[PDB]
Amino acid sequence: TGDERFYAEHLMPTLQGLLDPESAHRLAVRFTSLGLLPRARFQDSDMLEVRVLGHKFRNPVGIAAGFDKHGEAVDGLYKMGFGFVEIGSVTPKPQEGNPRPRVFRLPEDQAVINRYGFNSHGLSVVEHRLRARQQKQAKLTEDGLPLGVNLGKNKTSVDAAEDYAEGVRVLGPLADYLVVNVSSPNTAGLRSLQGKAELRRLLTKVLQERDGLRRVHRPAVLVKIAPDLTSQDKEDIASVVKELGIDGLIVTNTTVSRPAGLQGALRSETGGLSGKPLRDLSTQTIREMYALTQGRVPIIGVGGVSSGQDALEKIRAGASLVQLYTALTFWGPPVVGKVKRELEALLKEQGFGGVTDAIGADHRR
């Protein structure tokens, strides 16, 4: 499409050449929140509809956590064409995150490295922001456009489990699903919460708090995991998920690895790497987690999705829904319709009646 080309070849490179990545992001969030977006001409066909997590999703392509950290651009994101929106991570108290600069573009690799460290307006601010549009969201969700809330923990928190529990109590009633983010590489000690005993204890508390919410305000609970886990880690996560009845998994967060072949000058910056070099590592993690959970636990696949083929590979590997973030940084808003259009075409070409038929298809061949 003309829009795709204009954004890819002209607008985005100009934006990028004029502003550092954090400023560019702040501006993108502002424009999104004002609905200043190119025409999402793409109409979602029935083939793209998915029913999972106790909800209908008009299409399976969502915006990943981190773009709208504080819940400021939710409606603009649906307008962009996303079938669902996840905000966060939100921490219990407000916090500034790491010192700048803390995000870096690797254009030669179509990758980003970030070390934001959970900059967050905090639960109270986000709660009021979501309450101000709560009934509009109730109608969106009913219409097949659900909202997810991703929870983090404060840097100085003594008790991680209580941080997450507070998030469940405060934002749980405003969310269709909650994400327990235990996979940020930018908060010290956080990833150790993926370990079997820590995870079991943490998630038992989270699920207890969730179950204590009134029925119409009771969200699904998902756990978002790293792409850098050992086989033992993945086995243990699968075991805990099945033991506790966790509703789903988000696979994956950014990687602390630096795959061979990265060309960007900034490849050795500390932080999580996202984008294209993450793609197949993420897809393989989805494939493994789907097998370990016997295809019975919904997976949202995320990491390096920039095309319909990327989306479909994750869906065939076992993802019921997919998310993207970094591709937006390079291709802008037209990438969303592009992914949906290509995905629909590929589903038809490969003989699937719809997205639902393709979920986990690789494991049945």
Ligand SMILES: Cc1cc2nc3c(=O)[nH]c(=O)nc-3n(C[C@H](O)[C@H](O)[C@H](O)COP(=O)(O)O)c2cc1C
């Ligand atoms: C700048 C930036 C900030 C992010 N912040 C969060 C976050 O706060 N919580 C979270 O769970 N994931 C966060 N992520 C990870 C994304 O949600 C996603 O898992 C990861 O970037 C891989 O997807 P992608 O390759 O499409 O970007 C962030 C990613 C980036 C690039």
Ligand SMILES: Cc1nc(Cl)sc1C(=O)Nc1ccc2ccccc2c1
């Ligand atoms: C389309 C448009 N009209 C005016 Cl005026 S400014 C503007 C505009 O620049 N919109 C953008 C550009 C890039 C983006 C990247 C990510 C997310 C949202 C984005 C919105």
Ligand SMILES: O=C(O)c1cc(=O)[nH]c(=O)[nH]1
């Ligand atoms: O805030 C962060 O730095 C952040 C959190 C997260 O979950 N993933 C990431 O790449 N960065």
